[PDB]
Enzyme design. Structure first.
Site, PDB file in Angstrom:
ATOM      1  N   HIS A  61       0.845  -1.086  -0.095  1.00 48.85           N
ATOM      2  CA  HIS A  61      -0.190   0.082  -0.115  1.00 48.85           C
ATOM      3  C   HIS A  61       0.640   1.228   0.011  1.00 48.85           C
ATOM      4  O   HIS A  61       0.514   2.365  -0.484  1.00 48.85           O
ATOM      5  CB  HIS A  61      -0.903   0.021   1.098  1.00 48.85           C
ATOM      6  CG  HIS A  61      -1.789  -1.284   1.367  1.00 48.85           C
ATOM      7  ND1 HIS A  61      -1.586  -1.981   2.373  1.00 48.85           N
ATOM      8  CD2 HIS A  61      -2.879  -1.564   0.639  1.00 48.85           C
ATOM      9  CE1 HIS A  61      -2.587  -3.034   2.314  1.00 48.85           C
ATOM     10  NE2 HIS A  61      -3.309  -2.761   0.991  1.00 48.85           N
ATOM     11  N   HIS A  91       5.535   7.092   6.688  1.00 51.19           N
ATOM     12  CA  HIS A  91       5.242   6.753   5.226  1.00 51.19           C
ATOM     13  C   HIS A  91       4.834   7.791   4.333  1.00 51.19           C
ATOM     14  O   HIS A  91       4.734   9.092   4.838  1.00 51.19           O
ATOM     15  CB  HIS A  91       4.313   5.583   5.281  1.00 51.19           C
ATOM     16  CG  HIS A  91       2.930   6.079   5.621  1.00 51.19           C
ATOM     17  ND1 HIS A  91       2.691   6.027   7.111  1.00 51.19           N
ATOM     18  CD2 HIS A  91       1.854   6.546   5.122  1.00 51.19           C
ATOM     19  CE1 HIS A  91       1.299   6.341   7.209  1.00 51.19           C
ATOM     20  NE2 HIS A  91       0.998   6.793   6.187  1.00 51.19           N
ATOM     21  N   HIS A  93       2.159   9.195   0.635  1.00 47.36           N
ATOM     22  CA  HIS A  93       1.108   8.808  -0.082  1.00 47.36           C
ATOM     23  C   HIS A  93       1.596   9.897  -1.396  1.00 47.36           C
ATOM     24  O   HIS A  93       2.138  11.094  -1.176  1.00 47.36           O
ATOM     25  CB  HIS A  93      -0.268   9.215   0.338  1.00 47.36           C
ATOM     26  CG  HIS A  93      -0.709   8.451   1.430  1.00 47.36           C
ATOM     27  ND1 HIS A  93      -1.494   7.639   1.486  1.00 47.36           N
ATOM     28  CD2 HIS A  93      -0.401   8.870   2.898  1.00 47.36           C
ATOM     29  CE1 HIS A  93      -1.657   7.089   2.544  1.00 47.36           C
ATOM     30  NE2 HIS A  93      -0.947   7.887   3.387  1.00 47.36           N
ATOM     31  N   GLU A 103      -3.313  13.515   0.261  1.00 47.84           N
ATOM     32  CA  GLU A 103      -4.395  13.030   0.908  1.00 47.84           C
ATOM     33  C   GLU A 103      -5.259  14.590   1.288  1.00 47.84           C
ATOM     34  O   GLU A 103      -6.317  14.851   0.905  1.00 47.84           O
ATOM     35  CB  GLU A 103      -3.996  12.189   2.100  1.00 47.84           C
ATOM     36  CG  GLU A 103      -3.326  10.995   1.611  1.00 47.84           C
ATOM     37  CD  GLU A 103      -3.814   9.687   2.198  1.00 47.84           C
ATOM     38  OE1 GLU A 103      -3.343   9.845   3.615  1.00 47.84           O
ATOM     39  OE2 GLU A 103      -4.235   8.801   1.771  1.00 47.84           O
ATOM     40  N   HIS A 116       3.545  11.094   6.248  1.00 53.10           N
ATOM     41  CA  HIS A 116       2.706  11.129   7.519  1.00 53.10           C
ATOM     42  C   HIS A 116       3.905  10.454   8.365  1.00 53.10           C
ATOM     43  O   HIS A 116       4.133   9.359   8.341  1.00 53.10           O
ATOM     44  CB  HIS A 116       1.673  10.013   7.454  1.00 53.10           C
ATOM     45  CG  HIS A 116       0.532  10.707   6.530  1.00 53.10           C
ATOM     46  ND1 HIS A 116      -0.366   9.998   5.791  1.00 53.10           N
ATOM     47  CD2 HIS A 116       0.228  12.085   6.244  1.00 53.10           C
ATOM     48  CE1 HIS A 116      -1.086  10.695   5.410  1.00 53.10           C
ATOM     49  NE2 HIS A 116      -0.899  11.882   5.834  1.00 53.10           N
ATOM     50  N   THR A 195      -6.047   6.991   7.187  1.00 53.56           N
ATOM     51  CA  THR A 195      -6.502   7.285   6.028  1.00 53.56           C
ATOM     52  C   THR A 195      -6.419   5.979   5.286  1.00 53.56           C
ATOM     53  O   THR A 195      -6.815   6.151   3.992  1.00 53.56           O
ATOM     54  CB  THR A 195      -5.581   8.274   5.290  1.00 53.56           C
ATOM     55  OG1 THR A 195      -4.350   7.727   4.851  1.00 53.56           O
ATOM     56  CG2 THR A 195      -5.743   9.628   5.980  1.00 53.56           C
ATOM     57  N   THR A 196      -6.206   5.027   5.867  1.00 57.47           N
ATOM     58  CA  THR A 196      -6.240   3.552   5.201  1.00 57.47           C
ATOM     59  C   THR A 196      -7.289   2.836   6.119  1.00 57.47           C
ATOM     60  O   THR A 196      -7.200   2.776   7.445  1.00 57.47           O
ATOM     61  CB  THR A 196      -4.733   2.904   5.131  1.00 57.47           C
ATOM     62  OG1 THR A 196      -4.128   2.823   6.355  1.00 57.47           O
ATOM     63  CG2 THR A 196      -4.090   3.689   4.221  1.00 57.47           C
TER      64      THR A 196
HETATM   65 ZN   LIG Z   1      -0.800   7.910   5.543  1.00 61.52          ZN
END
Ligand SMILES: [Zn+2]
Length: 257
Positions: A61, A91, A93, A103, A116, A195-196
């Site tokens: 992911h 991590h 995005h 995001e 993040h 957010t996941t």
């Molecule tokens: Zn994140």
């Protein structure tokens, strides 16, 4: 089987994770014309001098850079927070194109990526207990735009070939996350969620106002990662972002005028 594809992406997550339609979901759009300065806020205290990075993992992911969180080595305090929050991982995005990937958005603007830095509240003893609490986590979010290279990101970029596919990990010791911060710690904050999946509403978000710059070469290397496992058809790890969710009965507060 959630993901970011054609038939399993964010618009489907609610079927397995009904809190996807909840009251405190993240990310959100940050409207700089309605966020209000809060004089009750304090400066952030980012204390990363003793951080112990361990490993980097492609989880299918994104990738996580993991830290030793068994002592108060890399902590976040202050700001909107009460108590001490320990860094567990960071991590990102990111997009397939430089005009999307973040995001959170700022006045509807999408950045190329978003970092993040995930921290959990030590009063709850471990991460897994923290995510069950409304004040369990604090996530420091930092926007990335494409421009100059970020020197402090390069060590991450250069290990990515070693963790191309889902389930691969590599040793990643002695990484200093201070090299990922912008100059200013001015921020917006609001209550929200992971957010996941599982999308738990356990996060105090702290989103920095100043983006960092990364180079086009750095972002291009992120876009060579794979969602798939080794020996499976290649699916580039791009566009691993959830879009903005309704703010509902929340206010975004600013630390700055
Ligand atoms: Zn994140």
């Amino acid at each position: 089987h959630w993901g970011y594809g054609k038939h399993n992406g964010p618009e489907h997550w609610h079927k397995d994770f009904p809190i996807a339609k909840g009251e405190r979901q993240s990310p959100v759009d940050i409207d700089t014309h309605t966020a209000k300065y809060d004089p009750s806020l304090k400066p952030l205290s980012v204390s990363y001098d003793q951080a112990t990075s361990l490993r980097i993992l492609n989880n299918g992911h994104a990738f996580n850079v993991e830290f030793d969180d068994s002592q108060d080595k890399a902590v976040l305090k202050g700001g909107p927070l009460d108590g001490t929050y320990r860094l567990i991982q960071f991590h990102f995005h990111w997009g397939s194109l430089d005009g999307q990937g973040s995001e959170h958005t700022v006045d509807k603007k999408k950045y190329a990526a978003e970092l993040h830095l995930v921290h959990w509240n030590t009063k709850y003893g471990d991460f897994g207990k923290a995510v069950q609490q409304p004040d369990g986590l604090a996530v420091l979010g930092i926007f990335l735009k494409v421009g100059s290279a970020k020197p402090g990101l390069q060590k991450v970029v250069d290990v990515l070939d070693s963790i191309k596919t889902k389930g691969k990990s590599a040793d990643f010791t002695n990484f200093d996350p201070r090299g990922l911060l912008p100059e200013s710690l001015d921020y917006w904050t609001y209550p929200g969620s992971l957010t996941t999946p599982p999308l738990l509403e356990c996060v105090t978000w702290i989103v920095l106002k100043e983006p960092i710059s990364v180079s086009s070469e750095q972002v291009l290397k992120f876009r060579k990662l794979n969602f798939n496992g080794e020996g499976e058809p290649e699916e580039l790890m791009v566009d691993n972002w959830r879009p903005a969710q309704p703010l509902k009965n929340r206010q975004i507060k600013a630390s700055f005028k």
